[PDB]
Design an enzyme around this catalytic site. Sequence first.
Site, PDB file in Angstrom:
ATOM      1  N   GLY A  13     -54.985  11.464  57.479  1.00 40.78           N
ATOM      2  CA  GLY A  13     -55.348  10.264  56.654  1.00 40.78           C
ATOM      3  C   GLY A  13     -55.308   9.004  57.486  1.00 40.78           C
ATOM      4  O   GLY A  13     -55.710   9.024  58.664  1.00 40.78           O
ATOM      5  N   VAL A  18     -51.788  15.824  61.217  1.00 37.66           N
ATOM      6  CA  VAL A  18     -50.503  16.437  61.561  1.00 37.66           C
ATOM      7  C   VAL A  18     -50.645  17.950  61.355  1.00 37.66           C
ATOM      8  O   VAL A  18     -51.118  18.356  60.312  1.00 37.66           O
ATOM      9  CB  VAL A  18     -49.308  15.917  60.632  1.00 37.66           C
ATOM     10  CG1 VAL A  18     -47.960  16.503  60.984  1.00 37.66           C
ATOM     11  CG2 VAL A  18     -49.177  14.457  60.775  1.00 37.66           C
ATOM     12  N   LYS A  33     -48.180  15.517  65.527  1.00 40.51           N
ATOM     13  CA  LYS A  33     -48.978  14.459  64.919  1.00 40.51           C
ATOM     14  C   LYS A  33     -49.845  13.796  65.910  1.00 40.51           C
ATOM     15  O   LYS A  33     -49.328  13.296  66.954  1.00 40.51           O
ATOM     16  CB  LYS A  33     -48.006  13.364  64.358  1.00 40.51           C
ATOM     17  CG  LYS A  33     -48.714  12.228  63.661  1.00 40.51           C
ATOM     18  CD  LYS A  33     -47.613  11.240  63.036  1.00 40.51           C
ATOM     19  CE  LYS A  33     -48.366  10.199  62.261  1.00 40.51           C
ATOM     20  NZ  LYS A  33     -47.222   9.294  61.644  1.00 40.51           N
ATOM     21  N   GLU A  87     -39.554  16.865  64.523  1.00 34.14           N
ATOM     22  CA  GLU A  87     -38.828  17.895  63.812  1.00 34.14           C
ATOM     23  C   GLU A  87     -39.542  18.445  62.581  1.00 34.14           C
ATOM     24  O   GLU A  87     -40.286  17.732  61.814  1.00 34.14           O
ATOM     25  CB  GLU A  87     -37.504  17.156  63.356  1.00 34.14           C
ATOM     26  CG  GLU A  87     -36.898  17.508  62.069  1.00 34.14           C
ATOM     27  CD  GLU A  87     -35.577  16.702  61.883  1.00 34.14           C
ATOM     28  OE1 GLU A  87     -35.609  15.455  61.838  1.00 34.14           O
ATOM     29  OE2 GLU A  87     -34.497  17.347  61.874  1.00 34.14           O
ATOM     30  N   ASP A  94     -43.197  17.824  50.175  1.00 31.62           N
ATOM     31  CA  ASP A  94     -43.038  16.349  50.045  1.00 31.62           C
ATOM     32  C   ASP A  94     -42.644  15.932  48.615  1.00 31.62           C
ATOM     33  O   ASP A  94     -42.868  16.661  47.612  1.00 31.62           O
ATOM     34  CB  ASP A  94     -44.221  15.569  50.608  1.00 31.62           C
ATOM     35  CG  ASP A  94     -45.477  15.444  49.656  1.00 31.62           C
ATOM     36  OD1 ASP A  94     -45.506  15.827  48.493  1.00 31.62           O
ATOM     37  OD2 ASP A  94     -46.495  14.924  50.178  1.00 31.62           O
ATOM     38  N   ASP A 133     -43.195   1.441  54.490  1.00 33.31           N
ATOM     39  CA  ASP A 133     -44.064   2.323  53.693  1.00 33.31           C
ATOM     40  C   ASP A 133     -43.248   3.352  52.926  1.00 33.31           C
ATOM     41  O   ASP A 133     -43.575   4.571  52.863  1.00 33.31           O
ATOM     42  CB  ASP A 133     -45.210   2.897  54.572  1.00 33.31           C
ATOM     43  CG  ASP A 133     -46.401   3.417  53.716  1.00 33.31           C
ATOM     44  OD1 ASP A 133     -46.471   3.061  52.493  1.00 33.31           O
ATOM     45  OD2 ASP A 133     -47.144   4.286  54.283  1.00 33.31           O
TER      46      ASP A 133
HETATM   47  N1  LIG Z   1     -48.913  15.268  52.148  1.00 33.39           N
HETATM   48  C1  LIG Z   1     -48.180  16.412  52.604  1.00 33.39           C
HETATM   49  C2  LIG Z   1     -49.045  17.523  53.256  1.00 33.39           C
HETATM   50  C3  LIG Z   1     -48.212  18.783  53.646  1.00 33.39           C
HETATM   51  C4  LIG Z   1     -46.985  18.403  54.540  1.00 33.39           C
HETATM   52  N2  LIG Z   1     -46.110  19.617  54.736  1.00 33.39           N
HETATM   53  C5  LIG Z   1     -45.250  19.624  55.844  1.00 33.39           C
HETATM   54  C6  LIG Z   1     -44.552  20.794  56.234  1.00 33.39           C
HETATM   55  N3  LIG Z   1     -43.723  20.778  57.294  1.00 33.39           N
HETATM   56  C7  LIG Z   1     -43.581  19.606  57.988  1.00 33.39           C
HETATM   57  C8  LIG Z   1     -44.309  18.438  57.680  1.00 33.39           C
HETATM   58  C9  LIG Z   1     -44.029  17.241  58.512  1.00 33.39           C
HETATM   59  C10 LIG Z   1     -42.864  17.118  59.326  1.00 33.39           C
HETATM   60  C11 LIG Z   1     -42.554  15.988  60.070  1.00 33.39           C
HETATM   61  C12 LIG Z   1     -43.461  14.920  59.859  1.00 33.39           C
HETATM   62  O1  LIG Z   1     -43.415  13.679  60.459  1.00 33.39           O
HETATM   63  C13 LIG Z   1     -44.572  13.039  60.011  1.00 33.39           C
HETATM   64  C14 LIG Z   1     -44.771  11.589  60.406  1.00 33.39           C
HETATM   65  O2  LIG Z   1     -45.775  10.925  60.087  1.00 33.39           O
HETATM   66  O3  LIG Z   1     -43.633  11.108  60.893  1.00 33.39           O
HETATM   67  C15 LIG Z   1     -45.357  13.745  59.157  1.00 33.39           C
HETATM   68  C16 LIG Z   1     -44.627  15.030  59.073  1.00 33.39           C
HETATM   69  C17 LIG Z   1     -44.939  16.173  58.394  1.00 33.39           C
HETATM   70  N4  LIG Z   1     -45.124  18.437  56.567  1.00 33.39           N
HETATM   71  C18 LIG Z   1     -46.138  17.299  53.811  1.00 33.39           C
HETATM   72  C19 LIG Z   1     -46.998  16.064  53.534  1.00 33.39           C
END
Ligand SMILES: N[C@H]1CC[C@H](Nc2cncc(-c3ccc4oc(C(=O)O)cc4c3)n2)CC1
Length: 271
Positions: A13, A18, A33, A87, A94, A133
């Site tokens: 987005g 990511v 990311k 991590e 979420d 945010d």
């Molecule tokens: N909108 C949703 C889409 C699926 C997503 N699922 C998952 C699953 N495992 C890890 C993560 C995961 C783990 C660490 C993270 O750091 C960032 C950042 O911007 O700092 C984004 C992010 C996403 N997300 C969670 C967010």
Amino acid sequence: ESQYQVGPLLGSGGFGSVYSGIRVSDNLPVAIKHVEKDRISDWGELPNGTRVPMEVVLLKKVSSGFSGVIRLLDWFERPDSFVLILERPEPVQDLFDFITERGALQEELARSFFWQVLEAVRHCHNCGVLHRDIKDENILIDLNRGELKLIDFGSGALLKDTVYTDFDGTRVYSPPEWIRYHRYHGRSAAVWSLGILLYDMVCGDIPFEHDEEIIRGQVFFRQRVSSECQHLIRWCLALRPSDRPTFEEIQNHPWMQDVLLPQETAEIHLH
Ligand SMILES: N[C@H]1CC[C@H](Nc2cncc(-c3ccc4oc(C(=O)O)cc4c3)n2)CC1
């Protein structure tokens, strides 16, 4: 590159894209990311001259074992992008999707989650970082341990005591002084966002969708919510910034007493 095995795209987005991944050396789960160079508005610099997005500066500042903020493990620069290795708890949902599934949260569950987000935001400010945010989309829930993690420092800034006149976080969490004047101070704007977040937890959706509603600041409760919890939310959403509570006043409010531990939260509500 050869250090990481890439798995499925998780999302994309404003923040970039990511992916799920694994660190090949010890099979540690990671998230990978990618941030495009030409979408990076703020740059900082490391204590050594390398020019990095400011998001990497802020993540380094808050990185540590304290589990409530996501930990940057490494980063790489490519010709048109930076790649951040973060991590990855597992399994994770979420908070936005969690609320989509469960609807409005029981207050004991909202209390446990809200408490954890306040501890994470205090850790950011202690480390000299303003997230800018805070919202359900930027909070991950470790479903086995009941621990929340604040993610996405891409709109953040170094914390200062003077006025901010720029903002690129989420407008429906932004305070009336930003809408009207394009000016806010970091801690009281963070407090306003936490009031929006708490309403979102206990009512199942945010209270304001339009500039006009943010500026009027009248809050109507669409679900049954206790008077103490409504008092805390209306205090966070005070129109005058200096009328909002400090983080200490939020955490000493009567609604916030007797919080569950994260493990008990998982055993009661998530398992
Ligand atoms: N909108 C949703 C889409 C699926 C997503 N699922 C998952 C699953 N495992 C890890 C993560 C995961 C783990 C660490 C993270 O750091 C960032 C950042 O911007 O700092 C984004 C992010 C996403 N997300 C969670 C967010």
